[PDB]
Every structure is written in C-alpha cells, then in structure tokens.
Model the fold of this input.
Amino acid sequence: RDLEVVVATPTSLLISWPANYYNIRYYRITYGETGGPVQEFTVPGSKSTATISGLKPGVDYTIALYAVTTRWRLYQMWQPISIN
Amino acid sequence: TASWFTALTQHGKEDLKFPRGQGVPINTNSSPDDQIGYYRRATLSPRWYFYYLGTGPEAGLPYGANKDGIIWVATEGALNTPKDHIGTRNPANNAAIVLQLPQGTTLPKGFY
Done:
C-alpha cells in the first residue's frame, strides 16, 4: 500500500511498502535511536516487507527504507516517524 | 522526449501535492493498470509536467524514490510496472493533451 508499519511489538516491528519486481536490486533498511549505534540491514528487491527486531522498548527510533536500482543507483523509499 | 500532457503552472506558495489516489491526469485511451507516474517540476515560475511510471527523464526512478520536484500519483488499481507501451510524446508528430483531472480532485492554492 504505502511505507508504514503493519504489526508493532515491544521488541520488533513489521514494515511494508509496495512491491517492485522490475527495477529494484535490493532494499536497505536503516534505523537508530532518535538523534542519539546506527544499524541497518538488507532485503532483496522481490520482497516488500521486512522484520526490524531486537529494539529497546519505550525508545524512539527513526526508520528509513533505501533502494538501489538496476542502473546501480541509490534512492530512499519515503521516510517514517517511529517513537514509543 | 515530451510530456504527453500540458503543464500545471504554479501561481503561489505551497508546492504541488495530491491526496492519495488523486493526481493522475485523465486519459480515456489508457487502461486502469496504466494509471501511475510522476509530476516533476521540470527544466521564472514553477511548472509540473506529468510523466508515466518508467517514462520521462526520470524513467529509472522507482515509484516512491524520494527526489526533489518529483511527486508520485497513482490511482487505485494501477500496477508498479513500466509504461513502455505508452512512452512519451514527440512534440513534432503530435501535440500535448490539455492536462485535465476528474471532478473532486483537490489542487493546492494557486493551481488551476
């Protein structure tokens, strides 16, 4: 649908965004506490959901999705506010 | 390369945006799955040209690639796939449709 969290949990969250099976090569998720140990991970293009996990309950966290295309280019898929 | 449609000329302050599901220019000779693309304030005043997904100067942009002066419009029912069958305009062998939008579609202030 859009880039937004589906299932939310005190230790992890499920994020989702509109699939693409012609243009993306992999997605790259990136996430850390707000302002202030950055973390990221990588998902293949065919997928369109991802499981961020092992978070600190109650703590605010800026998430972001990023995409690398077939033309070896880099772009971010929107940007989302997340704070407990 | 030429935008199949004509421009939305901005005459104010807030830039071009569209509530979700609004923004696709009307085109009766096009299928529901082809209803998708982007407005790019292109290269005075700002003017936003419509280009379909996978066509135009930014034809390698995924849908949702956050750039500047590009916005993504898609109608409920469209597919996330390229418009090779539609392509763009060639201003010699055709002229530009006047970009119309259905009824009820909202437009920012200073857009007509």
The interface with chain B takes residues 2-3, 17-20, 22-24, 67, 69-71, 73, 75-79 of chain A (CB under 8 Å). Chain A has one domain: 1-84.
